Amino acid sequence: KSLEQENSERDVEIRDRNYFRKLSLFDDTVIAGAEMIGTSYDVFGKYCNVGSCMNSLFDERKINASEDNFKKVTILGKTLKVPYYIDCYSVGDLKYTNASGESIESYQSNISSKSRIKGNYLFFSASLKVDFDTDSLTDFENAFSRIQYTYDLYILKSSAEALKEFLKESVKTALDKADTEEDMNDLFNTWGSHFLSGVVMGGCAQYSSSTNKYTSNLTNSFDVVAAASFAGFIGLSARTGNSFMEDIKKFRSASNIKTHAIGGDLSRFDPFGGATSADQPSAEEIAAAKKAFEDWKASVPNAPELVNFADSNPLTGIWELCSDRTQKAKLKKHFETVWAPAESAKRRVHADYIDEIIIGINNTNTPPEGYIGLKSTKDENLNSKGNICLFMHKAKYDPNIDNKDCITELKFITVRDKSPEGDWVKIPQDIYISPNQYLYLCYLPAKYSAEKAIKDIQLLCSSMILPYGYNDVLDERGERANATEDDNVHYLIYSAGW
């Protein structure tokens, strides 16, 4: 399924590259990627990828009508040409663009910030399913990291002002005529909200990981470890001391890692082609990793692709192409206050959370359909005597519907006939089958809260120390209750994942 997605992504990257180039009508002497400038972009799509391009806003017929619309440019000895509204800069350097977050929410905000579009939005959300396993996105124990190592061959930049004289008449009309909120929604939905104004052409290697925060037990910050893991993987320089060697080992054991490459001759070469996941790779293994990377890198100049946003003004609002400053401001305001927040809300991801807890006698410890059983390291009874089992149901957050109530707290009641006050719910089953002892689990339901919702309930089984950031389930006096009645110790613990 991974090789299928890999092939699928490359199919898009190649075919859509060909699509926009063909439609631009630019001849073979025109620098690669020229047609990306002034092409609109789905800001909620993939991170800088031709697949998320929407509509070229320039009039190809007008540009190509005269040789005077082009200027000379020299890249790597090649004498080519470029539409005069574009500024081209040779760079030829390797640079990291990294995104990370200790939760899916923080990760989404971090990658979105790379747009350099002001505000708190969730831009580039379609890249989540490209970079990570879908199920990993909603598992509360994961931290997320996306490492991109880019060979910046050259940068193409333009401005709204420079593109104005070559703008499609259909685009000018749409901008000028967008009156109602629905017109403006339709504008951003149809034409796109932004266009590419600053892009990097060349090649990149991508290395993305979902890492279990609880089992990784890292010394250094997971995002710095991820970058060191990437560098070592492809035979580049990586730290050994300051606990890095052990951190990199732990990181890899605790992570699901996906890789991708764009640009260069990928039919012959692969930046990850000789990659090694060994703790201590040999001289030959490192050399082979480095050789595969260097062979691919050398193929990039003759086969560049769109690979990154430039550092300044990579994406420009389509309203900047308006000739009327009142209309420009109106469209910008609709984006900032209505459309971007509405569209962002639809892409919001939160971890799965516990919405139901049940307890009963179960001889086979088989959960009812849709429910999951309580575990220590493996499946365990809450109370081994009388086969008392706890099962929980998990809900998936969905931005479009009113979400099911979450549970925010757990406690024990050790007396026979007492109901807890307020919104607290007592689970009816007496956990202690002894006739002279009582134990009931109580939970506190509340309207869904991403920060407050319990995500996990676990058993410590005789390993007795309370892990971060979990909580004990306490009786009336505030003490731990041994849930099992045999020659063993069961302590029930829970976490909202902070």
Ligand SMILES: [Ca+2]
């Ligand atoms: Ca049951």
Ligand SMILES: [Ca+2]
């Ligand atoms: Ca009892």
